[PDB]
Amino acid sequence: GKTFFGQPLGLSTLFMTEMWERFSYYGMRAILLYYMWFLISTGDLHITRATAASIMAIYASMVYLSGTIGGFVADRIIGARPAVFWGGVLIMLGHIVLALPFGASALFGSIILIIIGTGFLKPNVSTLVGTLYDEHDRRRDAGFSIFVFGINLGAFIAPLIVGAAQEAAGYHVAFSLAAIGMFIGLLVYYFGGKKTLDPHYLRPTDPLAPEEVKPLLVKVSLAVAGFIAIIVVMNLVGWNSLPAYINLLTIVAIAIPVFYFAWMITSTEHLRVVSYIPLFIAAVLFWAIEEQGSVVLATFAAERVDSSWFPVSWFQSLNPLFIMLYTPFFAWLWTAWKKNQPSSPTKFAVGLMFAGLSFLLMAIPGALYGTSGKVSPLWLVGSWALVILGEMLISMMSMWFLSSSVGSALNAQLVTLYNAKSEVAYFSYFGLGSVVLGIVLVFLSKRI
Ligand SMILES: CCCCCCC/C=C/CCCCCC(=O)OC[C@@H](O)CO
Ligand SMILES: CCCCCCC/C=C\CCCCCC(=O)OC[C@@H](O)CO
Numbered sequence: 001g002k003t004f005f006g007q008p009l010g011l012s013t014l015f016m017t018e019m020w021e022r023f024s025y026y027g028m029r030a031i032l033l034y035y036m037w038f039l040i041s042t043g044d045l046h047i048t049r050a051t052a053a054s055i056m057a058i059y060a061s062m063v064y065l066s067g068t069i070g071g072f073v074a075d076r077i078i079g080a081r082p083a084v085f086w087g088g089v090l091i092m093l094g095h096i097v098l099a100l101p102f103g104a105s106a107l108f109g110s111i112i113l114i115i116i117g118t119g120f121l122k123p124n125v126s127t128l129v130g131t132l133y134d135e136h137d138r139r140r141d142a143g144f145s146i147f148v149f150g151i152n153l154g155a156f157i158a159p160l161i162v163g164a165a166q167e168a169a170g171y172h173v174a175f176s177l178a179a180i181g182m183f184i185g186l187l188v189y190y191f192g193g194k195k196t197l198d199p200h201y202l203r204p205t206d207p208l209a210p211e212e213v214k215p216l217l218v219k220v221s222l223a224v225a226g227f228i229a230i231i232v233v234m235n236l237v238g239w240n241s242l243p244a245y246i247n248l249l250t251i252v253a254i255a256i257p258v259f260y261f262a263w264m265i266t267s268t269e270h271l272r273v274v275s276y277i278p279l280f281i282a283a284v285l286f287w288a289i290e291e292q293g294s295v296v297l298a299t300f301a302a303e304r305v306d307s308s309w310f311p312v313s314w315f316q317s318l319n320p321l322f323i324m325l326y327t328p329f330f331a332w333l334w335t336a337w338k339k340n341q342p343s344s345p346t347k348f349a350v351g352l353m354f355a356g357l358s359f360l361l362m363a364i365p366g367a368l369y370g371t372s373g374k375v376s377p378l379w380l381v382g383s384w385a386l387v388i389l390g391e392m393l394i395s396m397m398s399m400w401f402l403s404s405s406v407g408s409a410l411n412a413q414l415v416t417l418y419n420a421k422s423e424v425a426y427f428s429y430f431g432l433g434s435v436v437l438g439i440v441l442v443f444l445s446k447r448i
């Protein structure tokens, strides 16, 4: 009977939904940094480019931090399917804001909306993929890999389309294309959802019991009150610049996993919990490097590469393109190597080494040719090829979302150090350290 690549037909609906959401997001991010440079150039937005680069990073960090609680809100309060729909609506509006005839003023509002929207939609659409299968079903792992392919397909075509559009018709038109993308996603999700998805997920699957509401309400209130108290104090002492607020967001994001580990520490498994701290750190650093591709490598693409024959934002398509191209080989590998099954601990270690190699590679063109000229595009092609090899190896969801969020929070401080004069040193040292720490994990691997 009829399937979607051997899978339940509902997967097709979820496939397209997340593909288009990812289209809207990565299409936006492929030109967002350049947009801020533009606003800076016209004098409309008073920050340095270092700060603009910092904003791209903490933006990404908040988006995934939002996703750490999205599953909770859906499962306990509003339902997974409404979470996805209304999350999509918030994302679309966020994009519409940037298409409207405003400048810097629209930036904050657009970002907030998308942070909130993605937090609702992203974990829950992935959760919905699991709902197509029973606990028992074998196909479950194949389904998610297809889902991941869709994620990268959307991520792949968006820079091409949106980038071309910005150069031809301008930023507002381009941003509107991103909005249209999310809209298309909503249409297919809504009508395809009604046809192909279990109505059980129109409502929360674990609703709050009567005695759970008040303590939850206390919990969120204290967290919000405390967060706001700090902002009050920050203004009192004069720590009120945008870099100061970004520093606040970095800390909060980093504090969360620290506080989590630090007091959820029977000798049976205090060790076992402590065993995964190296694997979390490894993921954090790899995602840090991978996420800099839309910031540091995006800067290198615009400034240091001679690609005068197509929009420079197209370079953002290389990351997901390599994911798709690698899928065939890695599919073969996991089938073919039945015995091998290398450990998650060294998978993380090797993946980190590739990411560190990808940066060491980028140190070479500046070392060889100097930094005042322009080099071949294949340097970036080579850099993406290396880092994506790591990703294939690396591939709770909250914890996954957390790892990425922490990496991007780290980037928000690191990417400010990147500039023309720093270029080689930047790449050589953050590249080298990643290889070393990757190898350090190779010592403590089964000392675990
Ligand atoms: C999606 C981005 C893929 C980038 C792949 C680029 C592969 C091409 C590398 C050769 C570029 C060297 C110089 C560029 C070029 O051929 O045209 C420029 C020159 O003809 C000016 O008239
Ligand atoms: C207007 C602000 C936009 C919202 C920013 C995103 C939300 C920020 C902080 C809430 C995250 C709370 C983290 C607690 C949590 O359960 O997630 C981590 C959990 O997996 C621990 O392992």
Ligand SMILES: CCCCCCC/C=C\CCCCCC(=O)OC[C@@H](O)CO
Pocket (backbone or CB within 6 Å): 068, 069, 072, 073, 116, 220, 398
């Ligand atoms: C419509 C208003 C938009 C903002 C509302 C949605 C903001 C996100 C969450 C609101 C508080 C939910 C509490 C999240 C939480 O308790 O995390 C649970 C944690 O244990 C994760 O497993």
Ligand SMILES: CCCCCCC/C=C\CCCCCC(=O)OC[C@@H](O)CO
Pocket (backbone or CB within 6 Å): 081, 082, 083, 085, 086, 089, 093, 189, 190, 191, 193, 194, 197, 202
């Ligand atoms: C700016 C846009 C404002 C909102 C426009 C869309 C609102 C119109 C009707 C509300 C539809 C509610 C759908 C919520 C939902 O759970 O849909 C889930 C989907 O799977 C339907 O089966």
Ligand SMILES: CCCCCCC/C=C\CCCCCC(=O)OC[C@@H](O)CO
Pocket (backbone or CB within 6 Å): 055, 058, 059, 062, 104, 107, 108, 111, 112, 115, 227, 242, 249, 252
């Ligand atoms: C518990 C709540 C966690 C708080 C998380 C804070 C997330 C809210 C906003 C983050 C936005 C990222 C930076 C956006 C930004 O600086 O753009 C505004 C600026 O360009 C306008 O001059």
Ligand SMILES: CCCCCCC/C=C\CCCCCC(=O)OC[C@@H](O)CO
Pocket (backbone or CB within 6 Å): 005, 142, 145, 146, 149, 150, 153, 324, 327, 331
């Ligand atoms: C290079 C981009 C075009 C490649 C073909 C894209 C065609 C779009 C959808 C059809 C493929 C969707 C399923 C993807 C897929 O079969 O992945 C294979 C592997 O991941 C098995 O899970």
Ligand SMILES: CCCCCCC/C=C\CCCCCC(=O)OC[C@@H](O)CO
Pocket (backbone or CB within 6 Å): 092, 096, 099, 101, 170, 172, 173, 176, 177, 179, 180, 183
């Ligand atoms: C379906 C409703 C949500 C989806 C978005 C629909 C709106 C998207 C495009 C409609 C036209 C956008 C306006 C484009 C625009 O005016 O910017 C270009 C112009 O301002 C620059 O000179």
Ligand SMILES: CCCCCCC/C=C\CCCCCC(=O)OC[C@@H](O)CO
Pocket (backbone or CB within 6 Å): 096, 183, 186, 187, 188, 190, 191
């Ligand atoms: C100026 C640009 C337009 C600003 C307002 C845009 C609002 C237009 C459409 C919102 C999209 C609604 C979500 C699409 C959808 O599938 O809902 C259909 C469902 O409600 C049918 O009952």
Ligand SMILES: CCCCCCC/C=C\CCCCCC(=O)OC[C@@H](O)CO
Pocket (backbone or CB within 6 Å): 076, 077, 207, 208, 209, 210, 213, 216, 217, 220
């Ligand atoms: C912070 C943004 C304001 C929007 C409200 C977010 C509320 C976040 C946390 C408090 C959750 C308590 C309300 C839960 C609720 O609606 O109960 C419904 C049902 O489960 C009662 O049994």
Ligand SMILES: CCCCCCC/C=C\CCCCCC(=O)OC[C@@H](O)CO
Pocket (backbone or CB within 6 Å): 224, 227, 228, 240, 241, 242, 245, 246
């Ligand atoms: C969930 C907490 C809600 C508290 C409402 C107030 C939180 C406001 C902002 C959250 C952090 C973003 C700070 C970015 C910002 O406002 O930039 C300020 C900048 O204009 C200084 O010149």
Ligand SMILES: CCCCCCC/C=C\CCCCCC(=O)OC[C@@H](O)CO
Pocket (backbone or CB within 6 Å): 226, 230, 234, 238, 239, 240, 241, 243, 244, 245, 247, 248, 251
């Ligand atoms: C939960 C108890 C609260 C304890 C204090 C919470 C954390 C204390 C301070 C947060 C640091 C805020 C960011 C620091 C900052 O503003 O940087 C200043 C510097 O950039 C000058 O603009």
Ligand SMILES: CCCCCCC/C=C\CCCCCC(=O)OC[C@@H](O)CO
Pocket (backbone or CB within 6 Å): 247, 248, 250, 251, 254, 255, 258, 259, 262, 413
């Ligand atoms: C007793 C609690 C465990 C031991 C304390 C561990 C400290 C917990 C959280 C610290 C947050 C990490 C610092 C954030 C950070 O590195 O950013 C630095 C920068 O943003 C400051 O301007």
Ligand SMILES: CCCCCCC/C=C\CCCCCC(=O)OC[C@@H](O)CO
Pocket (backbone or CB within 6 Å): 357, 360, 361, 363, 364, 366, 367, 424, 428
């Ligand atoms: C799959 C293997 C790919 C290997 C790519 C990485 C190659 C390993 C190391 C690259 C060396 C970069 C160091 C650059 C350097 O020496 O700095 C030069 C500096 O003195 C001039 O400013």
Ligand SMILES: CCCCCCC/C=C\CCCCCC(=O)OC[C@@H](O)CO
Pocket (backbone or CB within 6 Å): 361, 364, 389
């Ligand atoms: C996992 C498999 C990875 C194998 C990749 C092997 C990588 C080999 C060399 C990478 C370093 C790049 C060499 C630098 C280079 O080619 O510059 C010379 C070029 O400018 C010629 O004019």
Ligand SMILES: CCCCCCC/C=C\CCCCCC(=O)OC[C@@H](O)CO
Pocket (backbone or CB within 6 Å): 364, 367, 368
């Ligand atoms: C498996 C590695 C493939 C080959 C990668 C070898 C990378 C090592 C060095 C790259 C050459 C660096 C450029 C030459 C260089 O920096 O000379 C020093 C010069 O800056 C002094 O003025």
Ligand SMILES: CCCCCCC/C=C\CCCCCC(=O)OC[C@@H](O)CO
Pocket (backbone or CB within 6 Å): 361, 375, 376, 378, 379, 381, 382, 383, 385, 386, 389
């Ligand atoms: C599927 C590939 C995985 C391994 C990729 C490793 C590639 C490492 C280096 C290749 C790119 C660096 C050399 C690029 C290069 O040759 O510069 C272009 C040269 O023609 C100067 O114009």
Ligand SMILES: CCCCCCC/C=C\CCCCCC(=O)OC[C@@H](O)CO
Pocket (backbone or CB within 6 Å): none
């Ligand atoms: C044959 C099928 C398996 C393919 C194995 C993957 C091949 C590994 C690396 C390919 C990247 C090319 C190496 C980069 C390179 O040598 O550039 C040299 C360039 O400077 C020549 O002018």
Ligand SMILES: CCCCCCC/C=C\CCCCCC(=O)OC[C@@H](O)CO
Pocket (backbone or CB within 6 Å): 254, 257, 258, 281, 284, 406, 410, 413, 414, 416, 417
């Ligand atoms: C278990 C949680 C993992 C935490 C991993 C994060 C590592 C801890 C702190 C990172 C702080 C990085 C600060 C780097 C720095 O200050 O330099 C950049 C600064 O110049 C920005 O202008």
